[PDB]
Amino acid sequence: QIQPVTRGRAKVPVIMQMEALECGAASLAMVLAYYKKWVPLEQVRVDCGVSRDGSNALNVLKAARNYGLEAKGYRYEPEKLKKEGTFPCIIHWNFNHFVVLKGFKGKYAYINDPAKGDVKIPMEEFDRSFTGICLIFKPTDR
């Protein structure tokens, strides 16, 4: 019954990466937890294929699909993410990193960063840090 939010912000629990290469897996774990899909974090790491190069967006999406979520990857400019995004979603960050985007309010983006916890990013900084790649999720039958 839990749907993505299209209007305000999604309430998403904070999960920290246990080490630096795990951000992809921590970010999908938070998305799974929003939909109450209980999957051990160790399993998520392995299903995302965490390696010495972190994870990649194709593998994050494939792992999400095996757990029953519909999953698609988009390239969006910042303004179209704000307009058409749904929450939570996973976004590529500083060409390096994955964080969970919960939504926007005022001059602020609301993120669960696996390296920092729950943070509020000023729009100007958001706009430079978001690289354009956004993984968008929807529950199963449709």
Binding site: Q17, C23, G24, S55, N56, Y74, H97
Partner: peptide, 14 residues
């Protein structure tokens, strides 16, 4: 959505 599998495979992060 608008990205192919090979393009998504090259998007990487920790």
């Amino acid at each position: 959505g608008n990205l192919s599998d090979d393009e998504l495979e090259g998007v990487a992060g920790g």
